[PDB]
Amino acid sequence: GMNQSIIFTEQLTWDVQLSAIHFTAQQQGMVIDCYIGQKVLEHLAAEKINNSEQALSLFEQFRFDIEEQAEKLIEQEAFDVQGHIQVERVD
Numbered sequence: 001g002m003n004q005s006i007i008f009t010e011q012l013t014w015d016v017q018l019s020a021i022h023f024t025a026q027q028q029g030m031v032i033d034c035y036i037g038q039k040v041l042e043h044l045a046a047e048k049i050n051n052s053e054q055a056l057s058l059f060e061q062f063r064f065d066i067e068e069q070a071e072k073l074i075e076q077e078a079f080d081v082q083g084h085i086q087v088e089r090v091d
Contacts, residue, residue: 006032006074008067012059014052021059025070025085034070034085044090065090 004027011024018035025032036059042048044065045058059066069090073079080086 004075006071008070012056014055021055023059023067023070025067025074027074032074032085033083034087036066036087036090040088040090062090 007026009024009026009031011022013022014020015022015035019038020035021041023034023036025034038049038055041055041058041062044062047054047058049055049058066087069087070085073085073087078085
């Protein structure tokens with residue numbers, strides 16, 4: 001229905017602590033850290049990841065599907081115990 005003004009701000013990095021692509025959303029000035037783990041992205045792409053350049057390229061290939069899912073999770077209040085959004089399934 002309405003415009004919740006959740007913006008994906010495209011700060012795309014690899015997080016070695018989590019083995020995940022870290023991407024950013026923002027709503028009314030507040031940043032929401034979002035993550036898609038290596039294995040999730042490998043399954044989605046049907047490709048194993050062996051270079052961070054490749055990881056970022058795969059995120060970009062599926063950016064709008066991934067961000068769609070993160071947006072839904074945010075709307076559904078599916079935040080984790082650190083206030084983050086973990087994308088566990090796409091498509």
